[PDB]
Each structure stands twice: as structure tokens, then as C-alpha cells.
């Protein structure tokens, strides 16, 4: 019963892999997960990087010597920390690079049968990462991913921000089931690397439900991957966003209002009367399954647009101009 073990850099239980090393899917396997874990612990601790592809992933002896050599170096770093050298700060957030590794790792150990999940169908990782940098978030914020799937986006944002809470809501059974495991695997692996995350919850639910009406209303940052949603769903979401508070934000893959919205007597009731909508800077090189470069849209709840329209109706000069155009 042959095995490979990697020690945690902060003394959690070791990662143990059987030999021969499992394959996770067409592009991922345990051997590369091991190599990349070592790579990433080395980025996490430069003394280790100091001490550390001429390796044969199909040879037990070659892979055992890699793991033994990492494990020795870890022991020696733990000794160094007992001395005068300061240990690695705990309670930090993972870098974007490490987080990407962690999420792949969590996925590798959580979604055993990809196929079961495919029948409900991560360049998104980079897009979300850009959004985390642009959309400033604080501990006043509540975050939701509407239609969260197996939960990856919620995990990523929770690892990276100070929002008071992060939620994902998913209706379908397969993805909700896998999210429970993703959650367990995520907490285990974040502990393994010694890294912190903000609070989060993954839930089974319908975000168009009556419970979610009030919850949407109290959320300050919503992400929603709506490009492929149909008009009735989008229409129903527009109605839930109408109760959001001023400064609330929605980031989506298809805008919920025209980018050039001109308020007038016929469109007074439209969601565009209460939000600024902008097309966000796209990430060079990122392209959708449609071939085009990706785009995403930021909506900010701003009721001063509506206020100014009403004020303008009181001004006979402005009222005439408006009336003459339309
Ligand atoms: C814009 C940026 C780039 C920032 C951005 C990038 C990514 C994200 N977020 C994600 O990709 N999340 C995971 C994949 C999308 N989820 C599809 C899931 O929706 C579920 N769903 C549908 C209804 Br309709 C639905 C519902 N009514 N109630 C609950 N779940 C629902 C459906 O069962 C699928 O499992 C958000 C923003």
C-alpha cells in the first residue's frame, strides 16, 4: 500500500496520496497537484524556495524523492521558526496565484464525477480576480453570487475580501450537493496552507423566491452570471434589484439596463431610472466560448438620476426642451 505524503507548512495533518497517483480529469492529476502544492508553498515561504521539470511523475522513486526533499525542508523551516526567525504570519489571505491553486485542488477532491455536473452547463477566476480589485469591498458589505453552482466564485471572493458575509444560492440538486463538499474541502485546504477567509455560506434555494426578495434587498454587492439567462428571469431580477439600497452594486455578464439610458415619460418605471450602468474594462486576452473578448457590467444603485428628472419637470425651460425632443 504505497503512498506519498506532503507535510503542511503550518502543522496541519499531512496531505496523503495513494500510489499510483490518481487522475482527476483530462487536464488534472494528483502528480501535478503535488508539484504545484510544493511550488506554491515555496512562494509562501522564501526560505523553503531557497532550499528547493527533471522529475518523472510516473516513477514512484522520483516522486518520493521530491516529496521527501520537500518534507525535509519543511521540518528544517519549522526548526528555524523555533529559533529567532519569525514564523510565517498566520491569518493572512492567500495571494491570487495560491488561491487559484487552492480552488483547483478543492475542485479535484470534491467533484468526483464531472460528467454528472456538466449536464447542468475557470477563465472566470481571472475575471472575478479583476472584479475583486476594482469593486472595493469593506466589512459593511454583504456579498451574494446569484446562482452559485458548486460555489467557486463565493469561495474566491470570501478568501479575498472583508465583506461581513458571502452567500451563494443555487437551485439545482447536483451542484448544491457538490457545493457542500466544496465547502468542507475549502476549509480543510485553507487550514492546510495556514490562510484565512471571511465568513461564507453556500445554500440550496431559489433566488427568485419570496425569501430572497428581502435578502436581495439587503445585499450590497451582487455577482450574477446572467448572459444566458432568459428575459423572464432577467425581468424578475430587475424587480428584486429595485428594492436595493443606494450605492448597492450588481456585476453581471449582461447588462440589466441600457448603457445610454435617457429617462422619459414612457420609461419612468424602468430599472434604468435608478442605476448607473457601465461596461467594465475587459481583461486583455480573455475570450468567451462565443469567440468575442469577454465583457462585464457594473450597475450602481443611484436614485439621484430619478430625482433630477422630477426636478427638471418643474422647470418650464427644461420641461419644454424635453417635450420638444420626445
Ligand atoms: C460578471 C462576473 C464576471 C463578475 C461574474 C463571473 C462569474 C459569476 N458567477 C458564476 O459564474 N457562478 C457559477 C456559474 C453560474 N451559475 C449558474 C447556476 O445558476 C443556477 N440558477 C439559475 C437560476 Br434561473 C437560478 C435560480 N433562479 N435560483 C437559484 N439558482 C439558479 C443554475 O442552476 C446554475 O447552477 C458571477 C459574475
UniProtKB/Swiss-Prot annotation:
Residue numbers binding S-adenosyl-L-methionine: 143-152, 170, 206-207
Locations listed in the record: Nucleus
Modified residues (Phosphoserine): 281
Domain DOT1: 13-314
Residue ranges crossing the lipid bilayer per the database entry: none
Disorder: Defects in DOTL1 are associated with an autosomal dominant form of global developmental delay and intellectual disability, with or without one or more major congenital anomalies. The patient phenotypes are characterized by central nervous system (CNS) dysfunction, such as mild motor delay and significant speech and language delay, and a range of congenital anomalies, including brain structural anomalies, cardiac defects, varied urogenital features and growth restriction. Variants may cause a gain-of-function effect leading to an increase in cellular H3K79 methylation levels.
Family per record: Belongs to the class I-like SAM-binding methyltransferase superfamily. DOT1 family.
Note: In contrast to other lysine histone methyltransferases, it does not contain a SET domain, suggesting the existence of another mechanism for methylation of lysine residues of histones.
Its biological purpose: Histone methyltransferase. Methylates 'Lys-79' of histone H3. Nucleosomes are preferred as substrate compared to free histones. Binds to DNA.
Assembly and binders: Interacts with MLLT10.
Official protein name in the record: Histone-lysine N-methyltransferase, H3 lysine-79 specific
Source organism of this protein record: Homo sapiens
